[PDB]
Amino acid sequence: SVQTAATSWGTVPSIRVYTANNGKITERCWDGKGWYTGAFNEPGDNVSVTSWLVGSAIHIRVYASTGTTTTEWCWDGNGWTKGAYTAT
Amino acid sequence: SVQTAATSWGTVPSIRVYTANNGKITERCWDGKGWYTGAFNEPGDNVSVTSWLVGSAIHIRVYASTGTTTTEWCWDGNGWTKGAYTAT
Amino acid sequence: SVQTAATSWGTVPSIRVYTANNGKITERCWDGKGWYTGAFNEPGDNVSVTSWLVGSAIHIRVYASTGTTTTEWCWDGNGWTKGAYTAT
Ligand SMILES: OC[C@@]1(O)OC[C@@H](O)[C@@H](O)[C@@H]1O
Ligand SMILES: OC[C@@]1(O)OC[C@@H](O)[C@@H](O)[C@@H]1O
Ligand SMILES: OC[C@@]1(O)OC[C@@H](O)[C@@H](O)[C@@H]1O
Ligand SMILES: OC[C@@]1(O)OC[C@@H](O)[C@@H](O)[C@@H]1O
Numbered sequence: 001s002v003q004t005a006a007t008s009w010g011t012v013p014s015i016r017v018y019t020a021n022n023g024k025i026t027e028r029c030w031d032g033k034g035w036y037t038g039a040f041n042e043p044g045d046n047v048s049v050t051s052w053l054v055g056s057a058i059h060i061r062v063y064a065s066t067g068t069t070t071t072e073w074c075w076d077g078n079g080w081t082k083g084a085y086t087a088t
Numbered sequence: 089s090v091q092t093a094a095t096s097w098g099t100v101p102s103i104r105v106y107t108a109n110n111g112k113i114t115e116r117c118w119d120g121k122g123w124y125t126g127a128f129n130e131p132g133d134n135v136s137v138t139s140w141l142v143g144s145a146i147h148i149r150v151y152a153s154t155g156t157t158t159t160e161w162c163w164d165g166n167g168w169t170k171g172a173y174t175a176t
Numbered sequence: 177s178v179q180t181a182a183t184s185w186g187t188v189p190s191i192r193v194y195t196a197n198n199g200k201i202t203e204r205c206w207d208g209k210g211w212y213t214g215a216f217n218e219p220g221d222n223v224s225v226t227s228w229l230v231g232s233a234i235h236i237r238v239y240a241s242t243g244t245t246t247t248e249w250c251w252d253g254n255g256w257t258k259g260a261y262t263a264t
């Protein structure tokens with residue numbers, strides 16, 4: 001079936017839910033005022049996530065896997081980009 | 089195989105492990121005194137979870153997926169009910 | 177495909193990413209100075225993780241599933257061992 005991963009921060013809270021569906025990962029967002037579709041959209045059959053909130057900054061790492069390849073996607077306040085993670 | 093999701097809170101800690109097995113999700117609980125079966129029992133082939141502890145209250149969100157449909161289940165101190173999450 | 181689970185702690189942060197690939201789970205680690213392969217290596221087709229940081233101690237629980245059997249693996253500062261978790 002589709003596969004999801006979820007993270008949250010703060011006391012509102014903010015929630016992010018990533019869904020791998022038919023080889024694509026998309027993102028749904030809650031910040032206390034309704035669910036909406038987030039900027040994250042990348043290929044993947046499987047997804048995991050972790051996040052850490054430091055001061056006023058949320059940092060999110062999304063691990064997107066297709067076949068035997070995992071790509072780390074990083075949110076550090078300014079859009080999503082690929083991170084240095086490799087599986088080795 | 090079966091698929092799991094896990095969350096924890098506090099310093100004991102409390103742990104909740106959700107297992108999607110044969111289309112059903114069940115919950116195992118640790119609060120420092122042995123594992124036991126929790127109240128959560130809902131359909132699903134895939135599960136993710138996030139939680140946040142505010143004051144004396146734990147809030148848990150379990151995302152249960154079957155086919156292309158994801159249902160959010162909410163614990164806010166008074167049993168499990170479906171939440172407003174949709175995948176859109 | 178391969179399946180992952182991720183956790184993080186502190187402000188560096190430390191990150192651990194577990195990958196179930198071809199029936200084996202391995203671990204990649206970030207502590208602020210490059211990714212490296214961690215000590216965790218156990219059988220599994222599916223993996224989830226949770227962790228909690230208390231004082232100077234990180235506690236990690238990895239739930240590794242093969243077929244209908246889930247094994248909990250515990251890090252409490254001194255290597256990985258099986259924990260008391262059962263699915264019942
Ligand atoms: O709009 C909210 C948003 O910026 O929050 C941080 C990340 O979750 C982004 O993908 C998302 O678009
Ligand atoms: O700032 C990005 C980065 O350094 O963050 C920590 C890890 O997620 C790394 O893989 C990643 O490249
Ligand atoms: O009995 C413990 C319990 O109430 O803890 C909160 C939730 O995890 C519930 O499903 C569970 O039954
Ligand atoms: O109190 C329940 C609720 O508002 O909590 C925040 C989100 O999980 C929503 O989808 C959900 O309906």
Ligand SMILES: OC[C@@]1(O)OC[C@@H](O)[C@@H](O)[C@@H]1O
Nearest residue numbers: 192203205213214215216251
């Ligand atoms: O070397 C870093 C390490 O000790 O960190 C704690 C656990 O993640 C271990 O598996 C790992 O080897």
Ligand SMILES: OC[C@@]1(O)OC[C@@H](O)[C@@H](O)[C@@H]1O
Nearest residue numbers: 118237248250252259260261
């Ligand atoms: O110290 C190990 C242990 O007691 O930690 C809490 C739970 O993870 C238990 O299953 C596990 O045996």
